[PDB]
Amino acid sequence: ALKHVEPQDAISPDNYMDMLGLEARDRTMYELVIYRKNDKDKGPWKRYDLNGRSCYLVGRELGHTEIVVADIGIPEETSSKQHCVIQFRNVRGILKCYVMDLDSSNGTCLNNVVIPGARYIELRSGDVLTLSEFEEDNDYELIFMNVHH
Secondary structure, eight states, rough: OOOOOOTTBBBHHHHHHHHHOOGGGGGGGGEEEETTTOOOOOOOSSEEEEESOSSSEEEEOOOOOHHHOOOOEEEESSOOOTEEEEEEETTEEEEEEEEOOOOHHHHHOETTTEBBBSSOOOOOTEEEEEEESSSGGOOEEEEEEEEEO
8 A cells, every 4th residue: 555646747648738739639649458358359448548637546446335446447356456556747848657556465567577666667658557466367458558640
C-alpha cells in the first residue's frame, strides 16, 4: 500500500496539447489497450482513453461486494486494489508517461520484466503491462499506445 501523490510536473495530455494550440487532429493521443491473454484473436477486450487525466490508478476489479478504488479496473485476481499508476509529466517541455508499481503483492511487469516498486519507469508506445511478476498468473495484457493521424 504505497502512498502515491502526483509530482509537481504532472499534467494531462489534454492540457499539454491545449497549451500548444493544437486542434484534435494534430495531437498525439494516448490509450491503454487491454487484451485477454487467452485469446487476442477477437481483438482488444477494452480501450481506455488516457488523455483527460494526468494520472490513472490501475487495479483489481473482478465484477464477481467489492469496493472499486482503481480508475482502470482489471479482472485479475492476483492484482492489487491499488496496483500501479500511469502518470503523465511535463518533463522540461516533453510530455512523458511513466508507470509506478505501488508495492503490490505480486508485482508489475513491463514487456514481461518485473519492475521495482516505488519508482517511475518510463513508458513507450507499444509497452505491455501485466499485473504480476509471473506470466502464469496473468490473464490480461495492458498495452500503452500513442495514437496519431
